[PDB]
Every structure is written in C-alpha cells, then in structure tokens.
C-alpha cells in the first residue's frame, strides 16, 4: 500500500489537484502512513487511487471465493489507471478552459455590439428590444461563467472514477462493474471529494458523434456494449475482446 501511495503521489504531482477550500472529513483511513493526520486534497486523491487498487484486489478475491473465474491484478494495472486519470483530467480541464475563454471572447464581442447599438441610437423601438435581449443574454452568460467555475471544482473525482472504470473495470459483468463504481463513489464521498453526483459514465466519456458512428458500425445499444466501446476507443494497453459472438469483431 505504501509503494502504491508513493508512486501515485509522484505521478499525480504534475497534475494540479490542489483545492484550498477542501474540508477534511473524518475516518477514511486507507494508507496507514498518511503524511499528515489531516490529509490534503492531493493526498486524499492518491489515497483514493490506492483504495481503488486495493478494492479491485478485494473484489477479485471475493469473485474467486464465490465461483472462481478470477484474473489477477498487477501493478501494470495501477500504472494504466494513473495514466488514464492524468490524460482524462488534462483533456477535461483543457476543454473547460477553452470553453471559458471562448465565453469571454463572446462577451467582449457582445460588448462591442453594445457599443455599436449605443452609437446607432445617437430606431428606438428596436433599440428597446435589443437592450432587453442584451440584459437577458448578459445574465445568461454570467451564470454560464459561474457554472464553469462550479464544473471546475468537480473535475477531479469524476475523472478519477471514469479513469478507474476505463482501466480497472474490465472483464467484469454489469453487476460487478456497478458494485465497483458505487464502492469507489462511496469512498470518494467519505473522503469529502467533490465528484459529479450520479454521474453517467457513457455520456461523460463519449460524445454524440462517437456513439452515432459506433451504432452505425454494428454496435449493440446495450449499456455494457457502449461502455466496452468507450474502453476500445480510450485504450492504452491494447484491447482484448472476450466476445462469445462475433459482434465486437
């Protein structure tokens, strides 16, 4: 556990996972040599990662006990999980910041249009409509800014869960996948990490056009099939398909 904690911390050091307003909860002890007694946000995230690995081992052992059919877990899986977490966090944060800067650019452009309207007044009937629509759009774009400021906070836990699902949640049926996901969610909740509540993995990890192309390319519409397709697209270790049929092929 200490080795996993150290390697996770080292690999997540590059990522900006610092939240000063984060409130330290009680309990949630996983690594038994936590650096502070009250952990920080980054240390809590690394503890959640090592808990994800440990609970993958626990679920593997329980599956072996109740019917066998168990694949062993290796540190390569942990490294793949960390790489997925890093890449996915980088992608999501980059998209959010690009949308924020585009919103700011649009705000300045609309301000210039306001200047144009002000100069043109100096017909009034259309002018009143322009000003009221301007005000409405103004509060709309402001609240868009604040909701970007709220999506930014929850970009860590959601991405962690999604990456864990991409890497660890394989070869496992729907029930076990959901059990593992809810276990990780409960751990994150107990660690007081803000992740998007009841987040839907498929939409968060796939776009409309990707699902459209998948369906057009003979993919079943089942949620399991969509999750498997997402794993196929966002792969670091080359995929292995256990398909009784030939549908995946």
């Amino acid at each position: 556990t200490e080795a996993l904690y150290q390697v996770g911390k080292e690999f997540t050091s590059k990522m900006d996972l610092e939240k000063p307003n984060y409130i330290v909860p009680d309990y949630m002890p996983v690594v038994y040599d936590k650096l502070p007694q009250p952990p920080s946000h980054r240390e809590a995230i690394v503890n959640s990662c090592v808990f994800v690995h440990q609970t993958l081992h626990q679920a593997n052992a329980r599956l072996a006990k109740r019917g066998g059919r168990t694949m062993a877990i290796t540190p390569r899986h942990y490294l793949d999980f960390i790489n997925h977490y890093a890449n996915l966090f980088h992608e999501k944060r980059s998209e959010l910041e690009e949308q924020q800067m585009h919103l700011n650019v649009g705000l300045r452009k609309i301000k210039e249009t306001v200047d144009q309207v002000e100069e043109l007044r100096r017909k009034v009937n259309r002018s009143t409509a322009l000003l009221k629509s301007l005000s409405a759009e103004r509060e709309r774009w402001e609240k868009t800014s604040e909701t970007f400021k709220n999506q930014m906070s929850t970009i860590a836990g959601d991405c962690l869960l999604s990456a864990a699902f991409i890497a660890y949640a394989g070869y496992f049926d729907q029930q076990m996948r959901q059990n593992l996901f809810t276990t990780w969610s409960h751990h994150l909740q107990q660690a007081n990490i803000q992740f998007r509540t009841d987040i839907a993995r498929t939409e968060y990890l796939s776009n409309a056009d990707e699902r459209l192309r998948w369906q057009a390319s003979s993919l079943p519409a089942d949620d399991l099939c969509t999750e498997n397709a997402i794993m196929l697209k966002r792969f670091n270790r080359y995929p292995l398909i256990i398909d009784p049929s030939g549908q995946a092929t």
């Binding site: 649009g106 759009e137 009841d198 399991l224």
Partner: protein, 450 residues
C-alpha cells in the same frame, strides 16, 4: 480486458431498457433528456450561442432590420429556459424514473431467469440448443405483436398481461422442440420462476429444497410401521416429511385420521388430498398446492406427475399446457415468426417420420417443395444446387434424413449464416434425434420434436 459476455445482469438491463422504450416511451424520453442534460444539451446550447455570435458579427449590430438578430436571440433565450427547467427538475424526473424502473424490474429479472434456464437446458438433452437471438425474438414478439396488448392502455394491466404472455409464449416456443416427459419439468421451472416473481408469496425455499433433496436425508434410525395401512417405505417418507416443520405431526395426524386409508387407495387421490400440514394462517393456493405436492411425494408417488400438473395449473394459470395438447399448427409458425435465415430443423424420435407434416403444410399453403434425399453424393450436389436456385426465387427446399452426414450440415450452417435474398424462401431439415447432428445447426435453427 474488454468483455462482451452476456450475463444475468446484462440481460436484466437490456430487458429493462426494451420494456421502458416500448411500454413507457415518455419515461424513456425523460431518460434520454437526462443523459443529454449532462452531455448534448449544453453542447448545442453552446453551438446555438456561437451561431448567435456569427449572426452578431454578420449583422454588424444593425438596427433597421432588427428581427434578424432578435429571432436568434429569442431562440437562445427559449433554449436556455428549457435547459433551466430541465436542470431544475433533475431530482423529480430522476426519482420518477426510478419509480417506473422499479415497477418494471420483476419483468426483467424473470426474463433473465427464463433465458438462462433455457440456455442451461443443455444438461437435460443434447437437442435443447437455444441462442440468445431466439429469446430476444420471443421478447420482440411478446412486446409488439401481442394480440392481448392491442386494446389495453392502462400501463398497469399491460404489465400483468405482458408477464402472462411472456411465460406462455416462452413455454409454447420451447416445448415445440422438447420431449414430452420434459414438458412437466419445464413447467415446474417456469412456475417456480413466477413464484419468485409474484408479490406477497413466500419463497417456500425450505419446502422446495425438501421436495428436491430433503427426502434423501439419512433417517434410517427411526423407521416404524405406524399404521398397518402405511408401508415401511411410506413410513420412512413420513419420517422425512416430519423433519419438515410444517408436516411435523403427520404421525399423530395419520393415527387420528381413519379415512386416510381409503385415500391412500384412491384411483386419483391427487384430486382430493386430506388437509395434513399444520399452519395457523390459511395458506394461499400456491402454498396449499406445494404442501399437497410434498404430501403426494410422501404418499402415492405414482400421482406425482398429476399433482405437478395441478401445481402448474394453480401457479401458472389453468390450461397453461393446453397449447401442447392441440395438434401442432406449423402453418403459422412457418409463414411468420421464422426468419428465412433460421432453418426449420425437423427432429423425430427414431422409428418415426415427419416429412408428411411439411408435405401437408405445403398442400395447405399451396407451395412448391423441392424434396431431396441426402444419402447420395449426387444428393449433396442437387441439394446445394436447389439451395442456390431457391434463394433466387423462394422455393421451400426440404432436405430429409440429413443426420447421416454431419459435415455437410456444418457446411450448410456456415452457408445459412450468409443472408438470403428472398424472404419467402424456407428451408426444412428432416432428421432423426442423433447425438452427432451439428450443435451449431441446432442453435441456429428452430427445433421441432415429433
């Protein structure tokens, strides 16, 4: 590892999605709106905002004709308002979603149970090969083309009708290629599945476990003749059922009873069984029937099949097996609900012939048949030629006695995996029940037992 394997929960989820899409399309549309709320909703909101942006830099803040930018702005306002209503209503829409899904969950659980029992039917006999596509065809038939769903629209009676029709259609589509002595076993399986499904009914797991294996417990020390009318082996059965708490006092009850002897010697005692099980609450028909079944397993095991039929009638509705008694009507089975990809595998117990059945079917439906015997090599050649020339037109090629050459049937399976140009084209394989026929062919075709 990327697993595509189907499982209990996978079938549960798929069935739940199908039933939600069909029975409650508005609820499913709310599901779609919820899922796009995290995704596509803000996406096309952003795209429409960008469209307003190029509209703004196109009109250059024009005032003479303001409606060009006013229409776009009001469209953005309406879209933002709709998104706002949806996001403000996420909690209520979601909670109503789980309400509806919890309403439709027992159907999915039963569907998974039925499909996996049907798939596990391999143990009973090698001829019971069933694919997933077969069960999904059953479900597609029971959803859309259900005659009993044509009128009802209350969304609450429809669920019960769907459950009953699902069980009935599964039984009718399975037992038509299943041995007669296995009909009662499959009936008990389906009855127990629905007993698990039904609400307000105890699982009776102790009673079922007794009925299955508990009679075989070691109780040799304790065998006494009881009354002279009770034989020693029947007395031992009395002991094993006295191990069950419900029938603990059988010995005293049969000592007290003086009409028990004539019932023991009745022609069909399963019709009227004396009340022996001691229970304070009057058990529902199902519990009474299962207690009666255990009693029959104790006394007069010859009427076990009759009491099993009675139990299936009381649980799965009376005349559940009545379709099997009616002579097979293959004209409906062949004209519809069979895709031309699936060949009708004609299975007959050795010492019997079934080609006359398809011949009279063709006579009824005034259709040409290209009957070919596969014994000779020229038989194989002309069979392949007939298959090639029939898909071009739709002739019902009917091979006979094809169990002789399993390899050619492997080849035929591989060929029929390829699609057929003509829909009206039909294929029939008359063959005996041998353990050498291709399993792949059995799974890919509709098996009929004669």
């Amino acid at each position: 590892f990327v697993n595509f394997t189907v499982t209990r929960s996978s079938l549960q989820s798929q069935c739940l999605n199908e039933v939600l899409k069909a029975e409650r399309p508005d609820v499913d549309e709310k599901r779609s709106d919820l899922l796009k709320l995290q995704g596509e909703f803000q996406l096309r909101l952003r795209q429409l905002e960008k469209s307003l942006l190029q509209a703004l830099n196109e009109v250059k803040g024009r005032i003479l004709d303001d409606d060009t930018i006013i229409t776009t702005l009001e469209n953005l306002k309406r879209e933002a308002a709709e998104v706002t209503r949806k996001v403000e209503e996420t909690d209520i829409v979601m909670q109503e979603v789980e309400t509806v899904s919890q309403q439709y969950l027992p159907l999915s659980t039963a569907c998974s149970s039925i499909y996996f029992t049907m798939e596990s039917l391999k143990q009973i006999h090698f001829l019971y090969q069933y694919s997933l596509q077969f069960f999904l065809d059953i479900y597609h038939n029971v959803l859309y083309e259900n005659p009993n769903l044509k009128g009802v629209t209350d969304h609450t009676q429809r669920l019960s009708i769907i459950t009953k029709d699902l069980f009935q259609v599964a039984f009718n589509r399975v037992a038509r290629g299943m041995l007669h002595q296995d009909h009662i076993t499959f009936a008990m399986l389906l009855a127990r599945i629905k007993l698990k499904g039904t609400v307000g009914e105890p699982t009776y797991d102790a009673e079922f476990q007794h009925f299955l294996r508990g009679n075989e417990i070691v109780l040799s020390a304790g065998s006494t003749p009881r009354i002279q009318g009770l034989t020693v082996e029947q007395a031992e059965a009395v002991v094993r059922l006295s191990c069950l708490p419900a029938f603990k006092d059988l010995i005293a009850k049969v000592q007290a009873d003086e009409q028990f002897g004539i019932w023991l010697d009745s022609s069909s005692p399963e019709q009227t069984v004396p009340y022996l099980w001691s229970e304070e609450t009057p058990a529902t028909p199902i519990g009474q029937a299962i207690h009666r079944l255990l009693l029959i397993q104790a006394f007069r095991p010859d009427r076990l099949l009759a009491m099993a039929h009675m139990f299936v009638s009381t649980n799965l509705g009376e005349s559940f097996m009545s379709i099997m008694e009616q002579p097979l009507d293959l004209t409906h089975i062949v004209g519809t609900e069979v895709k031309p990809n699936t060949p009708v595998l004609m299975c007959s117990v050795p010492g019997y012939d079934a080609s006359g059945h398809v011949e009279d079917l063709a006579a009824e439906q005034n259709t040409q048949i290209t009957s070919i015997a596969i014994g000779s090599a020229e038989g194989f050649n002309q069979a392949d030629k007939a298959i090639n020339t029939a898909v071009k037109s739709g002739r019902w090629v009917m091979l006979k006695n094809v169990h002789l050459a399993p390899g050619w049937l492997m080849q035929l399976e591989k060929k029929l995996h390829s699609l057929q140009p003509h829909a009206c084209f039909r294929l029939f394989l008359t063959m005996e029940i041998n353990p050498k026929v291709p399993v792949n062919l059995l799974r890919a075709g509709r098996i009929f037992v004669f």
